[PDB]
Symmetry: D2
Subunit: 276 residues, 4 copies
Amino acid sequence: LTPGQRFREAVATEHPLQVVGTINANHALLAKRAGFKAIYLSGGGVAAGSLGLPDLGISGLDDVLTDVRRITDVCDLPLLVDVDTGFGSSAFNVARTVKSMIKFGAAAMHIEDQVEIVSQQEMVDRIKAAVDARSDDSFVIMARTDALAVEGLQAAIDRACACVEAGADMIFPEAMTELAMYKEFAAAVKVPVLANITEFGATPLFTTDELASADVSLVLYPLSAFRAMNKAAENVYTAIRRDGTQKNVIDTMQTRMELYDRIDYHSFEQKLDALF
Amino acid sequence: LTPGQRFREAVATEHPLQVVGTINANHALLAKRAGFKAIYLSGGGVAAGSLGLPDLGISGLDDVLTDVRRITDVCDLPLLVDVDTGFGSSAFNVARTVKSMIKFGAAAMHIEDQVEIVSQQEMVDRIKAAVDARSDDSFVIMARTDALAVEGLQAAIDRACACVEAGADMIFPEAMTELAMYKEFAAAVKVPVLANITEFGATPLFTTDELASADVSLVLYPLSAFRAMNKAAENVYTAIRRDGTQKNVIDTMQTRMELYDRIDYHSFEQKLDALF
Amino acid sequence: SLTPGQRFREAVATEHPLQVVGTINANHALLAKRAGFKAIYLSGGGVAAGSLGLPDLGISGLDDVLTDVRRITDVCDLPLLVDVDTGFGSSAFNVARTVKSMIKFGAAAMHIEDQVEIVSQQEMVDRIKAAVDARSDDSFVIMARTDALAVEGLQAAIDRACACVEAGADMIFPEAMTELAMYKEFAAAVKVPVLANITEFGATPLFTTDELASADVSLVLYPLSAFRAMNKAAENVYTAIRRDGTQKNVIDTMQTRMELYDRIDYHSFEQKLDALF
Amino acid sequence: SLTPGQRFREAVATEHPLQVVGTINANHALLAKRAGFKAIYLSGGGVAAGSLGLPDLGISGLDDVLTDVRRITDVCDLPLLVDVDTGFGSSAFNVARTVKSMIKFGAAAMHIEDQVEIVSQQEMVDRIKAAVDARSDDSFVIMARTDALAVEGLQAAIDRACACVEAGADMIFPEAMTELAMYKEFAAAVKVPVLANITEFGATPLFTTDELASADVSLVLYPLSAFRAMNKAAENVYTAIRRDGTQKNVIDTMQTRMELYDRIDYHSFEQKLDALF
């Protein structure tokens, strides 16, 4: 199966499909072990995690592709990737973004209508450029829109329907925080709708049964693991500096034997034995 | 000050100098906020964290330099980098490693005598190659040796002294589990000695006071933060998969407002206002 | 819809012998396609000497080669045969990472050699086994390169090649074969496609496609030919500009702006924008 | 111990006008150094057309340019002037990452232009400020490139360039200037070093270093000259190989193996091994 076919199958056999943010290759394998069928590379996470920078469009296609290659080299779970507005203003930038994502093994990407949003026709043109560049039809193009917040619910439906007509496979409406609105949105746009359930934001922490009842097809936890990983890491640095040892924070650590297990150290031994 | 100058000064103004592993640029900034004067890029961390791979020499110079550039682009703490045996068998491979580490902003590297170890003359020739390629004399070349485990303490002192005569600035003896052995090693070798205080290994979790009494000049916590980060992330994946929400692991998460503070989001707005 | 390896196998099946030309960069891959070639090559000595300005002494790594592979295959659909030295590391895992990366970054084929003086037939077979096992797309071609002829003689080179074929090598690249009759004996014995490396200024005669076909050779490689001419031409420009204080005396040696626009298909970009918008 | 930027400023101070030659790759950087040039150039059109096989339509990005900067500056110590188009993104932060990345990867200087038609004088001044503020090494040269002459006329060009200088621009690259008398007037008004772009097959005449010295021009750029000769030579080889079934008829166009070993100083690697061991 192509990465994109895997993503489509995940969406078809889980309702709603849970998609978790994976900050690096290691966390992709943890996500697979935990039983998730799809994973996500947050653009905010590439910026804040990989580059230690704010999510202010400093991160480029190269930064994101590095993380895609590292994750898809070891993890076979379909990866949804945040590509912002396509990494440049031209249809040719959007095409290079699409073709590079497919080549480096990403299963899906979401592209947004940020410039404030562009006009419905500019967003349709962005989607047409991505659909036209696609060398593998199974690769999923998800249209992300901030139209609800800027122009209202009917504006967001009309824009999403125009994106679907242009070839968008799935819709990511931003700032949608009422289950009734998700349900009305899903009935109108017909294709799979993603609910972004991030923490410390506008949205209620809706559950999978709640989202399924509102006919939502995917639910995204874009930075959840990362936020816990930073608190845990900061506790270790503070403890080492204060105590002059890590001994008082040993209880918060993955063991050496857990790590060997989670990167499948044994399968490497097994490979050499089978070969020689 | 060159990164190398900062590393030398850190060792001169802290006894022993605490050097913490930083798996990514984000955690480099966390370590700086916690008050550490020096940080580390573990080669086992690039493998296990960045590539999701065992530490079996699959990770190469390019994988490591990508992590070096990401960290030194945003964090000004001197970075000590694990370069295995120099990423190739030639003096020219060791030379390209050295020059690339200096160019991409690393302050120090450690290079080891792994092939079982190489002859004392082979290790000396590796040090000479690295020392000859150094375009900036302040960049620290740290000789790492498994000679105590293979040939006993007197061999380990002889080899280390031979590395210092070849131009090695500092010494990283592997698997030293008695403060008395450190104390003796330090007086015999004369140059700064690093103690590798990793978890779940042979070494006791010695304190800064203990190591200062044994004349140890640097103490390394290579993966401490990483191991806590992975347990925290696995907890979040488990909870989300079990509960159909992240509701029950919110209390383990760095807040949005903390993330913004730790990647200094507000100095970006400040530069904008200060510039235009 | 063919994979790069299917394109490579199909080129070998439809041209006898198949001319494979070294392409130092994406621009020259496009020149080779326009000249009518069905396959191109990424020389390791060309990554070293051209892309890095370095001698071919194993300083160039997987990352360096992959960058050129990605630049070429992103714009040129011709199957790319790639020199991967000994696999960029001593471990079966290094060989596996090289094979998977070459497939992912769009190479059609790779050649891996028995250089450490050669390693034992067992070690070379182990290298091929590691490469064949790592292959995620069976259509990707693994070519075994061997210097056994010069080190151990013809029968040794034949035995090593057949062992490589038994380990799953698809095609064989013998080094230092200087006699046409030796290629014919070697091709009859090993059975799979044989590549003749017709580089310049080396031991090999400049054998023609007719001569190689008569010796049953399946591929003929011109690994650095365009690069060599490209460097003389460029040096003649630098010299002329430094000496004369102008490029006047080298204008006639240049590709025109209109030729370059044609060779990179500039106007097919404007047509795409019209087609779509 | 000179920084790249200091070497560039030293080259401009010691040669009038300073010849700056385009170098498509690290190999050609070493040829330019052998020919006696004191400064070299990474064309953004050359990264697109040569490294990527693409037209110069803003598809090439910071990563593509940095790879070529690193490859060249790793082996060639001549100061490299880099085309960074409009800074690779519309934010002052994009401009800042471009400046810091170019300094870290070993570039001596960059030109950044007022393309969006051009932006307003204030928006170009804001580009230069963003770049000047981001500079961690003040020896690194910021060159303002402007198409104001063609769009708004010479006085507009001078005022824009003077406002770029007040914002901290070290040097000026005026686009589409084709009269020696105009270079002289422009140079007199702006005061800082002015670069003449003497590309081929364009609107500019092939002005010589003496003519440009007489018009007070401080730098002369030959941005793609060597690349254009390299492409014609490489196409001649491909054409000959396809037509003849052999390279025999184009051997005389080729750099020899002995010349290639000389130009990448193969000897100095053997000498280094001897010295160390």
